[PDB]
Amino acid sequence: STAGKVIKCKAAVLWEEKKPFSIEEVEVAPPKAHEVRIKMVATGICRSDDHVVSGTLVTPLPVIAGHEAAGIVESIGEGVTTVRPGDKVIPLFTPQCGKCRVCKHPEGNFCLKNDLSMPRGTMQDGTSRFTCRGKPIHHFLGTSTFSQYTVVDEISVAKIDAASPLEKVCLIGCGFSTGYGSAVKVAKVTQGSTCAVFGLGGVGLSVIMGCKAAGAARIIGVDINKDKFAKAKEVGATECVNPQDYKKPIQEVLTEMSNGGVDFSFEVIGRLDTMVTALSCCQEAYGVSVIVGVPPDSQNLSMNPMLLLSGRTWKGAIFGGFKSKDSVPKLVADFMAKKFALDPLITHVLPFEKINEGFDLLRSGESIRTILTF
């Protein structure tokens, strides 16, 4: 019915930094070769989307943000072979072209066709499928899910299980996977280890889930907001500490608590200082610290290289290290199989039109993941 035609629908447009989203009428062009048009069913509000608003994450404006979602294919452009109209799909903010050096590398996942390193805010072809008030609107990480309908490159979409609950599996599009893979694939948390997770929002709780799934014996949650402690304990945290409660730097407290340094630390906040702190708190000779949090654009951190010379390992990753097209479908299967839970991350559910409200809940500290339904 709408196949091959321009669709007029509602989308949350971000016209300027530090402004509420503007729910308005947009024109979504029909999919070109190798492009898939998706009708959104659910989308979660991740801190990265708020980073676009606050200026922490730089991307061309105006833009239709949104990168954590699930929808149904409405139509496909010529040549698409991996999905079909009616399929349940999860847009992939980190593509998987499958032909570049990284996609071919056993451990790489940061596909070279990403729109993260030097954001263009367009489709793979350099153009936009969105128009608003007669003006072209930028895409965001090749996903733009804060719209009733979106247009993505074939390499930026994955077909998932037809019976998966879209209002829950959208978290596999970002939050959950990032968190879980960071612990289980990047850090490679080991059985009996001691972990330190800095930041207890949705990705941190998923980090905690991965550590617990890996057999960690101790999982110390760290947050300056004590209201996050309860849910952290529920998915696995054996202890939670609030840096504001101590008179000494949190890295000393954690070093003493772990009797010389943790085995694995994770920064899941987005601060230069906690990145350095999370590295210091890991054991000087064999500790491993993983940066997950996105810091303010263009800022450098300052650190003493002896932290690394003693033997520490410092690393980071996009989307928990997972090759997107291949793991998204498997993560959904595993979710379907009850291998991990998504419910503990979902604290509020709202209709898409209440997006600003959802951003207010995240900014106020009240929610973990608010899911927006269309």
| Binding residue numbers for NAD(+) | 48, 199-204, 223, 228, 292-294, 319, 369
Count of residues touching ligand NAD (by CB under 6 A): 32
Single-letter code of the amino acid located at 146 = F
Residue 42 interacting entry, from a second copy, Zn ion, ligand O=CNC1CCCCC1, none, C-beta within 5 to 8 Å by type:
none
Is position 227 an interface residue for a second copy (rule: CB under 8 A)? no
Binding to a second copy (CB under 8 A): which residues in 91-130? 101-102, 105, 107-110, 112, 116-117
Rounded-to-integer distance, Cα 238 and Cα 344, Å? 16
Binding to ligand NAD (CB under 6 A): which residues in 250-289? 268-271, 274
Single-letter code of the amino acid located at 104 = K
Question: Residue 67 CB, nearest distance to ligand O=CNC1CCCCC1 (Å)?
Answer: 5
- 196-219 burial by CB neighbour count: b if 16+ within 10 A, else e? bbbbbbbbbbbbbbbbbebebebb
Nearer to Zn ion, 69 or 111 (CB): 111
DSSP 187-246: I---TT-EEEEE--SHHHHHHHHHHHHHT-SEEEEE-S-GGGHHHHHHHT-SEEE-GGG-
Length of the chain equals: 374
| Burial class of residue 99, CB neighbours in 10 A (0-12, 13-18, 19+) | exposed
Residues 294, 300, 306, 307, Cα dihedral to 10°: -20
Is position 152 an interface residue for ligand O=CNC1CCCCC1 (rule: CB under 6 A)? no
Is the bond into 62 cis (omega within 30 degrees of 0)?
A: yes
Q: Are 317 and 288 in contact (CB under 8 A)?
A: no
Binding to a second copy (CB under 8 A): which residues in 255-294? 259-260, 272, 275, 283-286, 291, 294
Rounded-to-integer distance, Cα 271 and Cα 206, Å? 19
Residue 285 interacting entry, from a second copy, ligand O=CNC1CCCCC1, ligand NAD, none, C-beta within 5 to 8 Å by type:
a second copy
Query: Catalytic: which of 138, 139, 174, 324?
Result: 174
User: What does the DSSP 8-state code read for residue 321?
Assistant: G
Binding to ligand NAD (CB under 6 A): which residues in 217-236? 222-225, 228
Report the interface residues with Zn ion, using CB under 5 A.
Answer: 46, 48, 97, 100, 103, 111, 174
Report the interface residues with ligand O=CNC1CCCCC1, using CB under 6 A.
Answer: 46, 48, 57, 67, 93, 116, 174, 294, 318
Active site positions, annotated:
46, 48, 51, 67, 174
Report the interface residues with ligand NAD, using CB under 6 A.
Answer: 46-48, 51, 174-175, 178, 198-204, 222-225, 228, 243, 268-271, 274, 292-294, 309, 318-319, 365
